[PDB]
Design a binder for this molecule. Structure first.
Ligand SMILES: CC(C)CN(C[C@@H](O)[C@H](Cc1ccccc1)NC(=O)O[C@H]1CO[C@H]2OCC[C@H]21)S(=O)(=O)c1ccc(N)cc1
Ligand SMILES: CC(C)CN(C[C@@H](O)[C@H](Cc1ccccc1)NC(=O)O[C@H]1CO[C@H]2OCC[C@H]21)S(=O)(=O)c1ccc(N)cc1
Lengths: 99, 99
């Protein structure tokens, strides 16, 4: 797809086999979800955004699918106010910003 | 250009007569700069991100030149950790996400 930016660029994403939606966010280094329950242990990680920091749970080798592209990546789970697909995942699906 | 996302997508911007650098951020609704001095009246606003809220000043009808494309629109000013170009500005230059 070729997505304009008049509205927030949410995409359908299946993460851990669960159908969710998340914002394609070129300003985010990492992919973060708030409304998923992933299996197994996780490791503590911290991320920093506009208003300060959050403690997140880092889950590794998680399957992610967007627009037919299935990849294996790192997913953070934490109190983000909105699910975001970061550059880590977007590079895997070959997304670019164009103008 | 076509911008891959292996590194943070910074672009050169001219705002308030000054050359600045800012992150092209499709997860940001609005453009925000730190420490730039704009003429005219502003209104107080708040923006919300990961980690909490940010107090900013909103200036309207601000010319911005983004990697050499002219736009007139809203510019927020406040202590963001990184200057961001948001969707409000990127829609004015026809930016799209492609995958
Ligand atoms: C979370 C988004 C929906 C909103 N943010 C834009 C976002 O792209 C920020 C943009 C950003 C970038 C750096 C620092 C602060 C904010 N990125 C971000 O928080 O990323 C975090 C997750 O991955 C990590 O990598 C970058 C920081 C971590 S935001 O900075 O809060 C924001 C909110 C409103 C406006 N108008 C402009 C920006
Ligand atoms: C920095 C501005 C973008 C925001 N200002 C918020 C304010 O808390 C800032 C917070 C602030 C200020 C500067 C840089 C980062 C953050 N403080 C401030 O101006 O303090 C002044 C008095 O001491 C002087 O030296 C320090 C700054 C000067 S503000 O214009 O008054 C403001 C207040 C409320 C809202 N909603 C939106 C904006």
């Amino acid at each position: 797809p070729q997505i304009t930016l008049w509205k927030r660029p949410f995409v359908t994403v299946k993460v851990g086999g669960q159908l969710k939606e998340a914002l394609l966010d070129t300003g985010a280094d990492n992919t973060i979800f708030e409304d998923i329950n992933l299996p197994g242990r996780w490791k503590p990680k911290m991320v920093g955004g506009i208003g300060g920091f959050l403690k997140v749970r880092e889950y590794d080798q998680v399957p992610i699918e967007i627009a037919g592209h299935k990849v294996i990546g790192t997913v953070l789970v934490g109190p983000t106010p909105v699910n975001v697909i970061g550059r880590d995942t977007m590079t895997q699906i070959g997304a670019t910003l164009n103008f």
